[model samples]
Target: HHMHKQTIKEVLENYKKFLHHDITVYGWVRAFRSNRFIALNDGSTINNLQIVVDFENFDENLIKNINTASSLKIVGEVVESQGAGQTVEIIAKKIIVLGDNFTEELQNTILQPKKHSLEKLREQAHLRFRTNLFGAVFRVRHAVSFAIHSFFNDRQFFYLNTPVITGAGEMFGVTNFDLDNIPRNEDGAIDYTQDFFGRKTNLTVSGQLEGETAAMGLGRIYTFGPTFRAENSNTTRHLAEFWMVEPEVAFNNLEDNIDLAEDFLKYVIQYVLDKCKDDLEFLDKRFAEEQKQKPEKERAKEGLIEKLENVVAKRFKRVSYTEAIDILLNSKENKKGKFVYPVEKWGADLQSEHERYLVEKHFECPVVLFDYPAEIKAFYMRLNEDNKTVAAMDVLFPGIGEIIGGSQREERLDVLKKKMDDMHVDQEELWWYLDTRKFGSVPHSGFGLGLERLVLFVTGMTNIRDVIPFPRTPKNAEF
Candidate 1:
């Protein structure tokens, strides 16, 4: 009987074609009003499809099970609605309750049709996708992800899949040894030689090192995958597990890296702007309401759409790390001692407050800060001719401090070996990484863009946890 099943989105958008025609749709009940009108949404769009039912036509027992979040297969005729909000709605001919949500049990859940805080929705991570806010957030998230692959694929960059388990920073250990009875050496140290892989390993904190290896051969390569960190940070922007987009290109200088980042970000943002119109419009209103609740000083100057358009239209402000520090040092906020972490020294790492000041107050646009001090950056970054700073850069957004971090890598084997020695990085463990510098190495550049951070910016979400489906945080890994 279900020959022409259609998505609610398709039915709503192409209502004229299906006018007076019967169609079948499946969705979860959003609201059932007055024993007549049922608001149904299938997660195809933020808008709900209204289904008008006659109270006497359907069996009372079948209608009783159709509560909020109950799944249903609805067969109805598409007709013009006399209702106020929507232009088209379905006149129910058949109603099948696919799944029932007991009204008593649902009252205690976030799935109930009501305004719930983001934190409450997060606690119910498995069901948050049903909410209008998260539905829009995740739809935009998917669009951003698709755009990332499209952006690089158009430019001939190979999609390289890097290893997940490796020797990396602050990583989650992957071991087959039984914790209660782990094999030990005579000195009582854990004997990893008998374990899986015959050595100790952990989840990778980044794919950039491996991406660089592929980039050396392919000329241009990008890795999009999950990255894990054992950091115990519990904050709005920190997640123990997250997705990262790292693109490595051969023969690109620091300037080229900056250009590429700007272009790539703009492309992705503009793509979402074009594709996710309804979702962005819904989020724009949500963003405005959120700003109204915040303190005046903390609120954004522009709405979500305007902020996104600004990123696409304007040229990002590029300033050196030295210049940025100088700006912060001479600022009135510094003079007034407003900064929590005071900008005291030239080589000190810039905090979120300082980065925000540069982007929102001083430059009034996205800012790219380059030439960070070698001591503060990674051991692989190219040391400038002056021998003090490295060819590193950070792309700063208005709300998020650093969205993308990359650099021109040190290609000189002698210089890289020296930096490794000075930084106390294990040379024996990373011999494969060093091999790239030893071989026919060319100057290359790449950066790691936090996927959650980008989605946070586009969706006007404050918490990094909200952008991802299931957020992994300190002491929290709930499904």
Candidate 2:
């Protein structure tokens, strides 16, 4: 004497289980026959079930008008399908067209039953998510977001929402997306003295500096929000605006933080695979067959299933920054213009190619490279034993470089002051941030996860701009 709603996939998997049970199934029309073969999808999951209809016994004329966009409410009895070419189906007692979307633009009804390539779909971002692959990717993105907050919340970590708009010229620098849209006055100087917060406010680069205070009070805390970077490179990886998830923990060191990051990423990947099995399977099938006639396309998408499985089963390779530099500079004999961006030294910033070589070339998997020099990193990182390098890292996956950036921060007030002085950051603006260590000092660590990059990796989409809903770059904000 219990009643429930049945998903389209459930109807397919256990149609025999519901052999004698009364049921009502509702879904959108995926495809229809000449009053005979009708396919329906509930949108409950990506894989929608097929239901066959016969016009000889019912409204034959109405069946002819049912387009792909029409919503179907099929009340029926489950039975052994006897259609010419089919698996299981519904013996419909009644079929009603609940709604219509046959308008030319909204539902041109042209995206027919052929497979669509990823590139083709990305161009039609507005409608692409309606497909099985994209639907899975976006839903996975949603599920991973919840897992992030759930982890922090379960650990008694406070969730703090930092300001998107900030006026302080910077305690760090313009290391993030600088909209190029900063409001300027007659003198061409930023009218920061009297703008949004009574003056100019750039979109936050990263929230770690502000989130540090809450962690100082609560021991564990995190921030999940949109962080922008104005990098103009048009690679598959770079994005002008993206979401960043940064977890700042007090009384934690660099090693402690890397473990945290590993646990966090593993939690996310596992949650998505467990909860969205049907969706991911749908993606796997979609990937196997090439939708477009591109050369070697099928070969390129190989071993994706293996990659995700490896993540669930393997451990990340961890190494220090000095080791990674030696791996890159010592082996390669690149004669590139005497290195305008000088490298082969301890204090030099690691280039993207260098980071990739450390992960994909040597480790042949995901690797965490830590202990960067103070000259290249931000002001707050704890200085290392040598007095020159800062405790910083960039976690790189095989195909995706620098998916997460992190560090153990300076806790000593004197050292922090000197780093700030050496970096030339105004102390007056960062008075409260500096005051935390001075008053109740504790070593802390945190990192920022690039949401777009994560999406690109999991979905195997290859492009960063395609992952975000609305990408805001350096020159454009128009829809």
Candidate 3:
């Protein structure tokens, strides 16, 4: 059954030319019929095929063993039919129950080809991808990810697999999500004298710092991997663990970074659309239905078709973070709201709510906002010509807030050391990074985009939990 699923659609044209070709398949039964038809899948494609089980002389006892989650085998000739999905169906002359699912498991398992809520799927993440919704999503997610690498690799940009564990300082006040179970010294402090690598290390939050080191020498580099943050923002957007895509370039400035971001975003989106057409169409139909009920769910997949159709024809609009704040500051509707946080000036961080409003409501265009106030940003961002703000940029999409953050890294050793001291971070620890500047540093710029967040945006699913294959958030880390 699984072999036909993998081969049927893929080799359909070939099989149609040569009838009676023997092909063996092995895969789970996504859906089935009472001895007449069975929709089988090997998890190879978003859509599965039907196997017309012509079990006229076959045992009914064996047929009863197969369920929605059962494994099966099909032996037959291909029959070409008109489509809802792939046209060829296997006329099963013989059938076998490869594996049988228990009654208790069949009752408790959360996965099946059926309509399920994103919330429900999060609770059953281990098997969520087996369902139609998440299956389609993971497919697109994988495609978009592939597109990211192809974009950089094709451009001669080096792909750097950055260390998952790092000793770099996170954004000040941002709690790290890494574990702390190492042996301590006699003084009860974490023992640098005994710990692995002789110091503390945690999962990396942003790959920018390390990517910069490579960028200065490699000319261009990107780190695509997991980034962990321990912030307890329990909204659908924030996650204790997520995937981030960061690219750094040497001999570059803030403007060059922004151009790279725009092109990168366009490339990933267009590439996914081109590669996952069937998956996108399936998601588009389902997402359109979701929008009819709640409306907000529409933001993710909205304009995706149009975006894909005319991506090469469209130009992204660029907006400054200050102008973005002004647009929000002047909103008459915001005056009536009860949001606790205020967006008064340039120095404050833009909350997720404000970002959502900017892309979804205010600009209505996919706005790539840039040049944020220095006081609120990280220490590494280069100070602007005005000396008051930094060269930081954020690409905010309709549903996901701050999908990407890129900036011109502070190349001046004096300014960087001062910022670190003012921020109260230990300068003794960063001698290696500081040494980069003292030795042979050049003006470099880069950005980080969360891969899961990008998946959330592309899939139109609201929850970050749904996008990640196995999410690790506070109070929840079940396999």
Candidate 4:
């Protein structure tokens, strides 16, 4: 009985072969129009299958419950569509109401079908998947995710699953202790030694260190998993929990690291462009509508499709951090004090506005800036010959300031130890990480790309929350 069941995507794409043949499909009703037609989508593709039903042939009660968001099992024969928008449609021969969505209940929710705000849709994230905008965004997101694994696999990179719970930066603690009856040490500090792990442990902020250890043994390795940040940044780009893609390579210098990042980004983006054409076209129109509401000067120079194509087609501009600072200082925007954070001198950390300026105005493409000041960069980066700069790189996009950040790791045991001492990083806790340097460190390099940030750029989404399924942000953890 379930032998001929097919998705709406499958039936639509292969409708010619299914003509005059019976097939069953299951999906939620997107629209029930004129008491005769049903627009059904099963989340297989963005397009809905037009299910033409004759009201006289079906039970009145079944037809009555077939409102928007209702679930159905339909048996139908494929036929040429006389409608203008679609090529093929189904002539419903049998209909069963799987679930009923009362019109009264839907009217008060975001599923009412009239245009609703993105914020409102976020509040009802569970139901937002039925919307066209989110359907496209998430479909593209899946494509991007698959492309990431495929890209790494094809390149002979081993996939490594690092620990989610470890001793890491500003992270969420993993504790089984009773909050009201916590144990204390002689120093009056919380006794983490009595906790579940027998010591203080928090969610990992990054998997780079672990990936480095694997890379030293495996030669090339990549990690893709959820990472946590306990920072209270209430911004559109920040998330308490998000996915990261980190690729660590053995014997890769700063130049090689930059090359790997550029190639990896282009490959995944191009993969999505090829795989998600229809969704991207839909999002392109939506993006254009959004740009119309923005100020002329603040609007994107290119449409979403064009921007993505440009990134894949052209070479990203490479510049030193010193050169970028010079460009900012010489720009008319900086001279006129238009920048909220003015570029006054060298060695200053570049703000998002500055990074955007270099990508959107000066270079007019994706820019890779390298050789950052050592003080501003992390302790693991290789210190340059000048002792003042480090072999660090940041890939800046037009709208998203920094999409990727990486560096060639300091391999010399003495130098790494000194850098860690200066930065006050706990040497005892990270003894295993240091052992890689002591044994066989080979000037390896790696970088991290936030999955949500990549999706945000690919889907032309403004809020980071919209790209993820359920966002965990400050003061909000609703389903």
Candidate 5:
């Protein structure tokens, strides 16, 4: 029942205002020692509110019972703290145990003042949110999420909520037919005609089709939601389920799309750097400590905060796919056979190693590579005049490789159908998509930003698993 109280963040930020004032704060006990000091955390801030206990008046037996994660409310006077890290703290006048970590096992559970492995935390993702690392990450994650909405809103982009169950490629199937006792048509194919939607359905691998439809109507629209992939990639970069931010803009060519992507990324990165300073600083320090365990080559060249600001500070290096290939072919790394699937020609789809070589080793900055080979790209991307390349673009970051991929769509109805038909993409299945081109489809372009990769970049997290609270990968969907 502690009301009319300031959040720990508010109090800590403006401690002078609350100094000498009687205030009631509620938080979980992070530590209790010698019945004298109780470190309380409400997750309102990264830092704990130091609750100083007067053991002379307080019951030692009750106070000593307190442990990590014990829910509590402390009515106290705000006073100048003599603590090393904090500026001000609370002097406990009365203590109330709102909830108790009654069992010794529960009290000894993780979330202590110790370094916990990211892998271990992944197993306990539900509880991990209460930890300092996760607490800071969740806050920064919210900031990034907010910044995306703000950026799009400022630019008059419509926020589109597309259907989750859709019949689309880059998709995961959704069927009521049991896998063990499957329903089969007379044709010996799995019968989806009798399914829930009366046809085939799956989790949308992209919202771009719907987003582009929206953009055609509204001129600009962005979709921020979960996209699924059945890819069994168990790597630091791949996730079975992930979030994507895709923005489609009508009347924008490949060039305009590139500019929007660059500006958009810079704005979001800068926004977080400006807004989540405290959290970032904490993460920066945490990463610095973590760096010691890594080999010098594996460690990041820039700290977390520096890496974020650097992205915003520099103009991203823009190069065509052909030019990037040239560099790869001519580079010493390629010649020396350092590349695994070595780049020998122009038409090969770039591997992450090749992309990283360009962004991290060659250009030494964020690189936007456009005009990919048509065969290596999607049918929807507009084919270039040379008849060999498409107006596809990929924004590659250091270490993360390609963070965003998109292209100027083929608005010409004839060209789009031919491309789709030639590629054997079922035109009937995508009749509505073709309808967009049929009905006043002007030149339009868009790109998809992998939200997980963005979070990994911002948080200095190496694994794609660590950034998402509940990572869905092959053989693992427990949490």
Candidate 6:
């Protein structure tokens, strides 16, 4: 007597319990075979629920309208599946074509059964959600997202929403004024006094400074939001705009920071493995198929499930920058000229090639490299007693290079000022940021996690663009 619309996941997972009960199902048609069975999916799961449509009972015109991506509303009785594939299926008593739009257009598109290249799907990113690869990708995306918030929430980290527009030139400019012509004063200084916000401003590169302010007050706070950069990087690893997760903690040092990062990463990865089993399993299979197409030398030796399990299975290997340099200097790969940018000395910054070697070849696990040279590191990092290296740490992954970069911030006001002076950074512009130290600054530490890189690692996606919805990169902004 009772009626309710059920999600495909609800029906598919609990089909046995719903047997002999009349239920309503609404979803898009994934496959329709001879008008006898309709594979329906509601975006609730990767598995499609089979809806058996009695062709003789249904109007021929209505049956013709049912096609791929066609919306359907079916009132049916759950019965034992007659086929070997699925255990249960729907015996449709009433079939209504809610929307038959795009029945012909999607016939040959990525929505079809044939394999579609990742590039082709990018051109139709809006519609790619209907495909199996993206459906699994985004569902896993959602799981990772939930795991992030849950992990931080459980640890009592307050979510801080920092400003989108703030800059001293490391960010993308935000302007409503003309770029071609100038609004200048009588002196022709190209006055920004009349510009928006009465000064030059752009989208923020990082929320670390703002999060630090909140952290000094709140003890622990995390910011998860979109950040921007103007650098023109068209590589698979770069983006014009991306989301960053930065957390700051008061009274914490570099060791505490590393502990948080390692635990935090493991927690989120393990969470997805526990909750998104079906979606992840589908992705694992998809990744394996993709791997087979690659040259054997270029392919990853481990599968997706194994890579993920390995991350959570053990503690990340910790190595200092000096030690890593020595290892790279003496490595067989380095001697054979395998590294693109050779690791020659102690002060040189590690390239992606070098980072990958450390994680994949040297350790064969996640590695956290610390105590980087002050000259190559940021101005805010705490200087070491040797006056060369800073209290910096970069968390490296196997395929993906640096996943997280952080350090113990310099809390000594004079020491920070000296670094700022030597680096030619204006003290006037960052006075507010310095005020935290001037007031009550303790040894606070923080780190930034690139959200897309995490998703890329988890989903086994090659390009950073595929993991994000509507990726913003140079020369590509359609839809």
State the lDDT of candidate 1 residue by residue for 1-479, as single tens digits.
64656789998899999999888889999999998889999999999999998978888888788788999898889999997899999999999988546789898889877788888998899989889989999999999999999999999999999999885537799998888989999999988898898888899989898998999899999999999988888988899999999999999999999999999999999999999999999999999998999999889988999999999998999999999999999999998999999899898899999999999999899999999999989999999999999999999998887989999999999999999999999888889999998889999999999999999999998889899999999999988
For residue 377, model 3's alpha carbon misses the true position, in angstroms, by: 1.0
lDDT of 6: 0.89
Name the candidate that leads on lDDT: 1
lDDT of each: 0.92, 0.74, 0.75, 0.92, 0.88, 0.89
Could you tell me which 10 consecutive residues in candidate 4 have the lowest summed lDDT?
1-10
Q: In what order do the candidates fall by TM-score, top score first?
A: 4, 1, 6, 5, 3, 2
Scored against the true structure, residue 396 in model 2 reaches a CA lDDT of 84
Kindly indicate the candidate among 5 and 6 with the higher TM-score: 6
Please give the lDDT score at residue 371 for candidate 2.
85
Tens-digit per-residue lDDT, 154-241, candidate 4: 9989999999988553779898999999999999999888999988888999999999999988999999999998888899889999
In candidate 3, stretches whose alpha carbon ends up further than 4 angstroms from where it belongs are 1-8, 12-20, 82-86, 112-115, 169-190, 295-313, 335-340
lDDT of 5 by residue, 280-356 (tens): 99989988888878898788777888878788988999999899889999999999999889898889889999998
Preferred candidate (lDDT higher): 4 or 6: 4
Cα deviation of 199 in candidate 3 (Å)? 1.9
* TM-score (all chains, Cα) for each model: 0.97, 0.85, 0.89, 0.98, 0.96, 0.97
TM-score of 2: 0.85
* Per-candidate RMSD, Å: 1.5, 4.8, 3.9, 1.3, 1.8, 1.7
lDDT of 1 at 129: 88
Worst 10-residue stretch by lDDT in candidate 5? 102-111
Residue 205, candidate 4: how far off, in angstroms?
0.6
Tell me how candidate 1 scores on lDDT: 0.92
Please report, as a residue range, the 10-residue window in candidate 1 with the lowest summed lDDT. 1-10
The top-ranked prediction according to TM-score is 4
